[PDB]
Write a protein that binds this ligand. Structure first.
Ligand SMILES: CC[C@@](C)(Nc1ccnc(-c2c[nH]c3ncccc23)n1)C(=O)NCC(F)(F)F
Length: 286
């Protein structure tokens, strides 16, 4: 069924990014304010290149049906398309964890970790590369469920290759990037696994500001480094085994999972199927 533009009542801005904006809207055809609250994504500056990428993101989201992937609801046509998605009122895992801090125990962080792995494994079966796995891009449905949000940077692997090469990169979350992504702009399941190790780190630091991957990496390379020199030094640091520290109070076993994800050798990084099995075993033991 279709969504009429005239019936989408603006409520609040949710955020802005990669040439798009996300708003919380009430889909109210009855005009009595009893309509469903939905998340609406639209392009801000809609060029023919941006429309093309937006359409691809719509096709990607529509093709995904998993408990740990934000639900596609529809499209609203007025091109200047609007992507309609389910609204998750608890917001991002980043904001949720920052607010609720250590009142969320290790058992609970591992329940979220497992769900992220499962969502990522399912994504990999479709030959999709997320490229922006971070706690800011994970949504909380409720206390017991998290989902991967924002597919704006997702690439589909070529039929004959196991990596996607970005020729002209835009805004990049470099402190979540695998070394081959920094040096050769190569993205794969293995680079998504590297970013997952960074997600696990974020979780176990409970989003403490001084402990964030940009703060830790900047201290390691020197806060005097600027622009492209940050990328140059981060590459050399990663090459010489500089890694994010073990978060305070993080179990040894969870830090080992992070370090395995952060392997310079792309083939030696674990698989998401293995990670979900491993994390479920840790959970069971606890
Ligand atoms: C896309 C919206 C945006 C900019 N920021 C947020 C921030 C807080 N809360 C919501 C939100 C709540 N409920 C929703 N339901 C669906 C989509 C988004 C939301 N979004 C983003 O890219 N960051 C997270 C991602 F997980 F969505 F990817």
């Amino acid at each position: 069924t279709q969504f009429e533009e005239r019936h989408l009542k603006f409520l609040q801005q949710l955020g802005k990014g990669n040439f798009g904006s996300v708003e919380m809207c009430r889909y109210d055809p009855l005009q009595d304010n009893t309509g469903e609250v939905v998340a609406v994504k639209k392009l801000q500056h809609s060029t023919e290149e941006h429309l093309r990428d937006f359409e691809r993101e719509i096709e990607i989201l529509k093709s995904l049906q998993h408990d740990n992937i934000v639900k596609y609801k529809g499209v609203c046509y007025s091109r200047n398309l609007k992507l309609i998605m389910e609204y998750l009122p608890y917001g991002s895992l980043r904001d949720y964890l920052q607010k609720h801090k250590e009142r969320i125990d290790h058992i609970k962080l591992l329940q979220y970790t497992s769900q992220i792995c499962k969502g990522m494994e399912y994504l990999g079966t479709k030959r999709y590369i997320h490229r922006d796995l971070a706690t800011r891009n994970i949504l909380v449905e409720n206390e017991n469920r998290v989902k991967i949000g924002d597919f704006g940077l997702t690439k589909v692997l070529p039929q004959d290759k196991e990596y996607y090469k970005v020729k002209e990169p835009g805004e990049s979350p470099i402190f979540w990037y695998a070394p081959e992504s920094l040096t050769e702009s190569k993205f794969s399941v293995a680079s998504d696994v590297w970013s997952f190790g960074v997600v696990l780190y974020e979780l176990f630091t409970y989003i403490e500001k001084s402990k964030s991957p940009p703060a830790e990496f900047m201290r390691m390379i020197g806060n005097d480094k600027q622009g492209q020199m940050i990328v140059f030094h981060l590459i050399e640091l990663l090459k010489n085994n500089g890694r994010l520290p073990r978060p305070d109070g993080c179990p040894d076993e969870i830090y080992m999972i992070m370090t395995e994800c952060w392997n310079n050798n792309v083939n030696q990084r674990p698989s998401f199927r293995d990670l979900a099995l491993r994390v479920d075993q840790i959970r069971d033991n606890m």
